[PDB]
Amino acid sequence: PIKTYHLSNLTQTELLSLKSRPRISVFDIVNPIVDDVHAHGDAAVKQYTSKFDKVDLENIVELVSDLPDPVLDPAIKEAFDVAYSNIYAFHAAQKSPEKSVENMKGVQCKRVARSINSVGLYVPGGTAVLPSTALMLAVPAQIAGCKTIVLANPPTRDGTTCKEVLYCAKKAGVTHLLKAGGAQAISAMAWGTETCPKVEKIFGPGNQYVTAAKMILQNSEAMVSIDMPAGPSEVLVIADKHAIPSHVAADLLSQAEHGPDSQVVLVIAGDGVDQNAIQEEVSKQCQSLPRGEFAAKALSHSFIVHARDMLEAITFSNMYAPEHLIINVKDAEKWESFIENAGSVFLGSWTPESVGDYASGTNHVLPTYGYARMYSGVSLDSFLKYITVQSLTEEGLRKLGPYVETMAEVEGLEAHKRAVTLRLQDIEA
Amino acid sequence: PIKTYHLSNLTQTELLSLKSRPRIDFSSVFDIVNPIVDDVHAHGDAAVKQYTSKFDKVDLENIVELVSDLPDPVLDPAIKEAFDVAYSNIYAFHAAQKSPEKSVENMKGVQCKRVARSINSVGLYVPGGTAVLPSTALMLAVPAQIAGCKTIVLANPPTRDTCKEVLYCAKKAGVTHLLKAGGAQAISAMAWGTETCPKVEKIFGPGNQYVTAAKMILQNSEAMVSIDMPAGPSEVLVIADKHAIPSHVAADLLSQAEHGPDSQVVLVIAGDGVDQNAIQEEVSKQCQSLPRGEFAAKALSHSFIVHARDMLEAITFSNMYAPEHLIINVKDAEKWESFIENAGSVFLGSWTPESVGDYASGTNHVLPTYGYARMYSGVSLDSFLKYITVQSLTEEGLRKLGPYVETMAEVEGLEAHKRAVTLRLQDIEA
Ligand SMILES: NC(=O)c1ccc[n+]([C@@H]2O[C@H](COP(=O)([O-])OP(=O)(O)OC[C@H]3O[C@@H](n4cnc5c(N)ncnc54)[C@H](O)[C@@H]3O)[C@@H](O)[C@H]2O)c1
Ligand SMILES: NC(=O)c1ccc[n+]([C@@H]2O[C@H](COP(=O)([O-])OP(=O)(O)OC[C@H]3O[C@@H](n4cnc5c(N)ncnc54)[C@H](O)[C@@H]3O)[C@@H](O)[C@H]2O)c1
Ligand SMILES: N[C@@H](Cc1c[nH]c[nH+]1)C(=O)O
Ligand SMILES: N[C@@H](Cc1c[nH]c[nH+]1)C(=O)O
Numbered sequence: 086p087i088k089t090y091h092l093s094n095l096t097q098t099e100l101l102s103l104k105s106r107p108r109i110s111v112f113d114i115v116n117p118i119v120d121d122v123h124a125h126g127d128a129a130v131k132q133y134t135s136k137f138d139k140v141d142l143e144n145i146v147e148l149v150s151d152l153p154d155p156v157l158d159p160a161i162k163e164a165f166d167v168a169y170s171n172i173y174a175f176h177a178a179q180k181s182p183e184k185s186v187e188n189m190k191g192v193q194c195k196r197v198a199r200s201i202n203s204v205g206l207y208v209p210g211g212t213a214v215l216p217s218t219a220l221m222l223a224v225p226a227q228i229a230g231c232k233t234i235v236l237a238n239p240p241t242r243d244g245t246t247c248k249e250v251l252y253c254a255k256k257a258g259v260t261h262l263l264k265a266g267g268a269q270a271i272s273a274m275a276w277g278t279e280t281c282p283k284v285e286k287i288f289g290p291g292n293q294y295v296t297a298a299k300m301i302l303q304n305s306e307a308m309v310s311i312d313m314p315a316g317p318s319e320v321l322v323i324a325d326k327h328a329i330p331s332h333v334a335a336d337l338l339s340q341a342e343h344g345p346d347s348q349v350v351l352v353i354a355g356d357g358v359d360q361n362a363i364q365e366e367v368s369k370q371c372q373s374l375p376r377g378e379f380a381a382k383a384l385s386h387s388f389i390v391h392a393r394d395m396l397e398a399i400t401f402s403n404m405y406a407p408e409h410l411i412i413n414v415k416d417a418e419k420w421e422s423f424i425e426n427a428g429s430v431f432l433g434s435w436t437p438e439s440v441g442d443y444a445s446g447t448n449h450v451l452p453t454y455g456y457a458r459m460y461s462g463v464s465l466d467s468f469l470k471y472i473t474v475q476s477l478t479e480e481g482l483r484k485l486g487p488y489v490e491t492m493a494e495v496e497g498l499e500a501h502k503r504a505v506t507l508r509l510q511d512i513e514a
Numbered sequence: 515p516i517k518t519y520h521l522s523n524l525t526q527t528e529l530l531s532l533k534s535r536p537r538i539d540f541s542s543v544f545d546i547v548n549p550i551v552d553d554v555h556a557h558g559d560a561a562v563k564q565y566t567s568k569f570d571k572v573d574l575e576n577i578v579e580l581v582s583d584l585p586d587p588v589l590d591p592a593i594k595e596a597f598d599v600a601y602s603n604i605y606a607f608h609a610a611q612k613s614p615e616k617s618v619e620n621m622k623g624v625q626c627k628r629v630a631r632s633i634n635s636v637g638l639y640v641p642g643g644t645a646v647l648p649s650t651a652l653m654l655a656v657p658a659q660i661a662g663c664k665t666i667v668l669a670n671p672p673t674r675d676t677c678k679e680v681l682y683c684a685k686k687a688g689v690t691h692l693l694k695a696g697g698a699q700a701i702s703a704m705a706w707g708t709e710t711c712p713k714v715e716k717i718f719g720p721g722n723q724y725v726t727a728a729k730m731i732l733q734n735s736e737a738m739v740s741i742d743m744p745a746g747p748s749e750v751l752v753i754a755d756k757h758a759i760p761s762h763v764a765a766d767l768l769s770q771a772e773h774g775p776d777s778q779v780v781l782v783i784a785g786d787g788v789d790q791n792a793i794q795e796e797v798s799k800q801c802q803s804l805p806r807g808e809f810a811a812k813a814l815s816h817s818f819i820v821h822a823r824d825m826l827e828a829i830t831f832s833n834m835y836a837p838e839h840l841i842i843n844v845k846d847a848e849k850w851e852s853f854i855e856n857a858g859s860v861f862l863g864s865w866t867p868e869s870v871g872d873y874a875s876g877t878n879h880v881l882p883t884y885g886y887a888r889m890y891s892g893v894s895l896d897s898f899l900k901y902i903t904v905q906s907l908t909e910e911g912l913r914k915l916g917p918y919v920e921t922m923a924e925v926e927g928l929e930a931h932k933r934a935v936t937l938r939l940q941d942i943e944a
């Protein structure tokens with residue numbers, strides 16, 4: 086049975102300890118792999134793939150335009166097309182119109198979007214192969230107009246890339262496919278290799294080694310950034326007495342099954358919830374799951390929290406800062422304004438996280454560990470830089486210049502002042 | 515005289531070497547900075563005070579003040595007027611970035627949306643090493659104020675003599691706490707919290723290589739903190755053609771050279787007809803009369819002039835270098851805007867010295883350096899926000915989308931994902 090707490094019973098210290106996650110040192114493990122791929126390129130990459138993935142490969146990088154359109158069972162194709170369609174739509178909707186701002190006459194300022202020229206997209210292939218993720222990452226990259234898009238994916242035992250992953254890659258305009266995983270893949274993209282293009286930003290979810298390699302390389306001389314630490318999946322469910330216990334259980338197990346590293350949280354809000362029934366459903370449903378062993382392992386670090394009301398429930402959720410939040414309560418939409426920290430939100434009774442994981446259109450590459458306090462999930466803007474642009478007329482510089490001179494004086498920065506003064510003297514003549 | 519290159523003369527290797535900055539490699543700065551960070555982590559305010567004494571030559575007992583406790587400082591009314599114009603322009607440019615939160619409904623009964631939420635607590639580093647920068651306080655605090663961040667800690671090393679212009683801007687932008695500290699010890703105090711300093715979730719702002727390296731380190735720490743960007747030693751790249759007035763070009767190059775010895779400046783000469791000698795005569799002439807000419811000259815020692823056949827070549831090189839600031843002082847500057855790919859902030863034309871952007875045009879001067887303009891944006895309103903995605907399905911919606919979700923979950927080998935849909939659809943069925 087899942088561990089239980091009551092919020093009023095807890096000291097500040099006990100409460101704050103509930104923010105902690107199950108898994109971890111990783112830098113120590115991962116650093117030598119990164120440096121080795123930095124120094125030795127494709128050769129090291131192949132070796133790392135042999136070691137962990139138990140696959141020997143000579144061609145680790147394929148141009149996607151060279152590879153044939155894979156053939157898919159048509160129900161599978163139809164499903165991934167619905168997903169592509171919904172994700173495309175949700176992300177295309179995020180294009181901001183670039184309005185000029187002119188608050189002083191002759192002082193024109195603006196923002197313009199430019200795509201990151203090359204990006205690397207890590208698509209997990211460990212305990213489960215995730216073409217959903219390929220759509221989550223490649224679709225917004227396609228919309229952004231990124232010129233080089235390298236998608237990394239560790240191969241299957243027979244040396245092959247999952248055909249659903251290749252389908253999505255082609256549909257979203259991925260240019261290069263890196264048949265590699267883990268920290269060796271992340272390092273190959275960050276540094277470039279003989280065959281792998283060097284990227285400017287690395288995206289995507291992964292295991293703790295992938296995640297730690299991402300975190301390391303952002304500080305390296307490779308000159309690379311990342312989206313976020315998007316590690317082991319989490320879900321927090323808030324349920325009231327109207328929620329159907331079996332659906333709640335199903336929802337908790339939907340992400341528990343990802344891995345033993347996952348963490349799940351049930352917040353019971355108000356009176357009237359048959360916690361026993363929920364518990365009975367979790368055990369019942371868990372033991373019939375192919376991945377019930379992983380799920381049970383994940384459940385072992387999961388917990389139930391009882392909250393006197395919905396404001397208290399959502400207040401706790403905000404402290405925990407879950408990757409995913411399912412609000413299964415009466416009038417769930419009305420509580421939306423109290424949500425502060427959550428990567429993605431599922432409101433109501435007909436909105437299992439699964440729809441967001443796969444095809445509602447939102448992005449499932451979301452921050453874990455509590456990183457939802459300051460990071461957003463992947464979005465169109467994750468692939469863009471906003472360059473600010475300004476242009477002054479003579480009149481404009483006559484109006485604004487003297488104030489800039491005053492402020493430069495205050496800061497003790499005479500050259501800053503002179504660049505204005507020199508121009509205003511020239512205008513005077 | 516400033517080193518000169520011609521692009522046609524260069525091998526790929528020589529060309530790519532022009533991207534390097536005078537900043538020390540990251541591991542070296544990390545070696546210097548790590549012990550300061552760990553020491554503040556472990557030992558708190560006491561450690562911060564020691565490093566302030568050591569580097570800033572100031573002994574202080576109260577490192578954290580509540581802005582609401584401190585009195586409204588009194589300013590020369592010309593100064594107060596200048597900072598108010600700046601506040602106004604910056605507020606306006608940043609407030610303009612509020613995105614209307616449109617719902618998306620591409621399938622009936624599948625509603626998806628984005629909502630903005632402010633980061634609850636933020637730390638804003640305002641430089642005060644070789645020069646005190648209240649401009650930066652506005653650059654960081656104003657968008658924080660617009661975002662609605664609840665705790666706003668502003669860090670600023672105290673002067674040898676808190677700068678009253680820094681406190682003016684802090685009060686005007688709603689800063690809650692003032693941390694009278696600088697460097698890596700300030701950054702660590704904010705990332706970890708101390709006995710008196712609030713723990714923040716995100717750390718912003720520009721600084722020297724130590725500040726910058728401390729930021730970079732702490733994002734990987736167990737503090738659970740993010741940063742805006744590496745916003746290190748100022749850079750400017752000027753593109754000039756034959757219509758540009760040599761003295762203005764010189765003035766512009768020196769405007770950022772004076773920031774410090776580690777700054778880097780680049781002149782790209784585009785096309786024919788540019789009196790490079792006149793530009794150089796102006797740099798030397800103008801540099802030696804500058805209070806900070808010593809810093810500027812040292813920065814000029816790592817700076818260089820590049821000759822490019824035309825404007826397309828000039829802008830192509832600028833994109834490779836990826837400058838923090840780009841001044842395009844050429845005929846029809848605005849028409850080349852679509853070729854700009856990597857630049858933090860852009861100044862078009864002849865009447866737009868970087869200074870206006872540094873101080874009061876309204877754009878944000880906290881911009882990525884070192885080539886990080888290739889993938890990072892300057893600070894903006896969204897830097898202070900998270901966009902939480904939200905979805906809601908009707909029964910009809912789940913009936914329509916659910917089967918596809920089931921198929922995809924099957925493909926991924928994830929049966930529990932499938933069952934969470936299946937279970938709901940069966941109940942709809944009965
Ligand atoms: N937050 C998010 O956005 C998000 C979304 C989806 C999935 N996820 C998470 O991503 C995780 C992916 O893990 P995964 O392994 O399935 O995919 P993975 O691709 O991240 O890992 C496979 C690669 O990691 C390396 N690896 C695996 N086991 C190793 C070991 N013991 N030692 C060293 N290297 C090893 C291998 O080199 C291999 O190529 C899941 O647990 C899931 O919960 C997160
Ligand atoms: N990119 C941008 O957005 C931007 C904007 C404005 C300014 N800047 C830059 O900010 C920088 C400001 O630097 P500054 O030094 O004047 O002020 P600063 O506040 O960045 O740093 C000064 C502090 O550094 C610490 N320090 C000094 N020497 C040290 C050492 N040897 N080891 C460890 N710590 C040490 C001290 O605590 C001191 O308080 C300049 O380079 C300027 O160009 C960048
Ligand atoms: N739930 C995973 C995403 C996923 C992929 N496949 C199934 N689920 C996450 O967002 O962390
Ligand atoms: N030039 C600085 C900004 C600045 C502050 N004060 C003067 N200038 C930068 O953007 O890097």
Ligand SMILES: [Zn+2]
Nearest residue numbers: 318339340442
């Ligand atoms: Zn999932």
Ligand SMILES: [Zn+2]
Nearest residue numbers: 748769770872
């Ligand atoms: Zn400046």
